[PDB]
Design a protein around this ligand. Structure first.
Ligand SMILES: [Fe+2]
Ligand SMILES: [Fe+2]
Ligand SMILES: [Fe+2]
Ligand SMILES: [Fe+2]
Lengths: 202, 197, 197, 202
């Protein structure tokens, strides 16, 4: 069938060892990336080998898992994608850039103001019960805030994800314990707005 | 501009032996127009006015709006469903490209039909059974109630409706008999056109 | 020993104008007996032999056994459904006890019926709409597919089946008209007995 | 209308300050009980007061939330109950007691052996994806293992809960981070078997 075996791989986030203070500590990123993310990577790779999914791209694996209702594969493959997306969403504070004019317009149009968007994104992330994610998605020029639970993700949907925050407790418990609002508040300072704008141009 | 529907071409003729014109009257003039009315009502006076149905569906899904998602997606599902069928003498045939991908994912066309049929039979409650194209690999997907691959980064090729209203008047609980007769009204040229858009 | 059903006393007469004898023919002899045989098939050769249907349902629910849960609970749901109805001349009345709890919980019987009815209309897809007693406080519950309060620490008082097969032959897409006329067959004697013991 | 208003309350677990080493540290119990459990208690009391659920038992409030699909009420009220049950399920390693011959009888029958039960329960709890709980329940004399998600709980069901472990990440992340198997491994050493026996015989 093939003799060109491939697996998924992960590269260190550039800020892995220095951290994302004051939002996310270097300690948290160690357990988050070397623990959770690599666990999802190894499990996705184990479940796909020796099957018709070997060598398929991660997004094809995610959509096959979703359409065939394969829970174990969906949970690991989509968690593998969500964290890779999550790392691009953030940067050390001095390297975040700013909201582009074009992106600022669509935030105003969909939410009134940038300040209002942040509060509604934050309140939505706080209200997201249990493990999951809160997303900013672009629907053909209209922006929306989406909550998902556990590994569910808009990567499966006909939308463009612009931004996500992880509210699984492992994303913040070492630094913030039960104070998720304090986690989300400081997380705004590490949002990589250069990436959000680049996601908008596609 | 409100969303609108046009009668399926075979509305008065029916799709015997799968679906009678009687059933099509209730299915289109009842259920499908009901979904159309609710959708227009839910969108009227909102920021969703003058947006496509697909945008309306994805807005409903991403914002977890059940009432809007259920009616707008059901509105899309039936329009796709009607396009998937034709009277037995106007079905066309499975294209060489499509047979090729069917054989790849399921071995043979006969095997595909079998598994597709078993999947629709196993689909408990209300819902739909779909054939989708995932970047060159075909898959059979069951969805519940109004759920639909129209939300997903996949291409739907074919669907059969297994809500009981799609078949109860002609077949009552004989859903297997509905599905196997349903194969005779599959609009294969539509399926092939979905593969090559 | 394996589970059994006995014919509803009114199987040949129907519940006109709510449910015809024909609908009852497919509803009982088709679906309900199908759920019975599959429940019987799944518990045969297993540790569930000898256990009551309720134990089987709770075992299926706690172990996430979908096939066993769907069949066994639908098997219970339909039995409870039949006892909830009677021919229009044999429905009995709302007792003073139940009437007090209805207006305590819902304001008036008129507001209750409207809201129970509005609830069943809103119960999207296949499912059931229930009146339940929670230690003296009553509530309206919507469930999907085979889901049921029989698993819960509540006492069920009344249910209407809104699977489309429950009503499609008599009312097709007119679920409100099925519910409107379903009220005339509510075995209000039975609902009051559920309120005791 | 009456003149004896009531509220839900919590008492400190007896081991709150000593901890449950090596399974759960005193620091975790501080955030878990004083943080999470008390937050669930105040939200439950705040949601019911001034309503027709005021002065109703915790179990009645839960079934009303569940039957009427009241998400905010169900999540807080049921989590209030889940943790209270969880604290009774545990005791310091020197005060756990032993499995009674009658409880041992039902375990062997439903699971083959006590060794096989612990593995199944542990494997079930490791596979419980996201936030949730893993339970041992008695169904009219037959025992079963149940996984639930987020706040879901057999307190809603016509069964007797015998034992639960909390697998929300806040239950273990400060002591064990992503090593949930190691948390569950040590958690067996703090299981209060005499509480499990009392649940069976009541
Ligand atoms: Fe994470
Ligand atoms: Fe339909
Ligand atoms: Fe039914
Ligand atoms: Fe907890």
């Amino acid at each position: 069938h093939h003799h060109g075996s491939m697996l998924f791989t992960l590269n260190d986030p550039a800020y892995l060892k220095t951290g994302l203070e004051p939002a996310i500590s270097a300690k948290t990123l160690d357990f988050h990336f070397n623990g959770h993310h690599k666990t999802y990577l190894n499990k996705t790779n184990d479940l796909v080998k020796g099957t018709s999914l070997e060598n398929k791209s991660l997004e094809d694996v995610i959509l096959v898992a979703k359409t065939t209702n394969n829970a174990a594969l969906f949970n690991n493959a989509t968690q593998l994608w969500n964290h890779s997306f999550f790392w691009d969403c953030m940067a050390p504070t001095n390297q975040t850039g700013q909201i582009s004019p074009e992106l600022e317009k669509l935030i105003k149009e969909s939410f009134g103001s940038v300040a209002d968007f942040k509060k509604k994104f934050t309140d939505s992330a706080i209200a997201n019960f249990g493990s999951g994610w809160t997303w900013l998605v672009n629907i053909n020029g209209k922006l929306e805030i989406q909550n998902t639970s556990n590994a569910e993700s808009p990567v499966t949907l006909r939308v463009t994800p612009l931004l996500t925050v992880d509210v699984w407790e492992h994303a913040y418990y070492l630094d913030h314990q039960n104070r998720r609002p304090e986690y989300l508040n400081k997380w705004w300072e590490v949002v990589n707005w250069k990436f959000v704008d680049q996601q908008l141009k596609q």
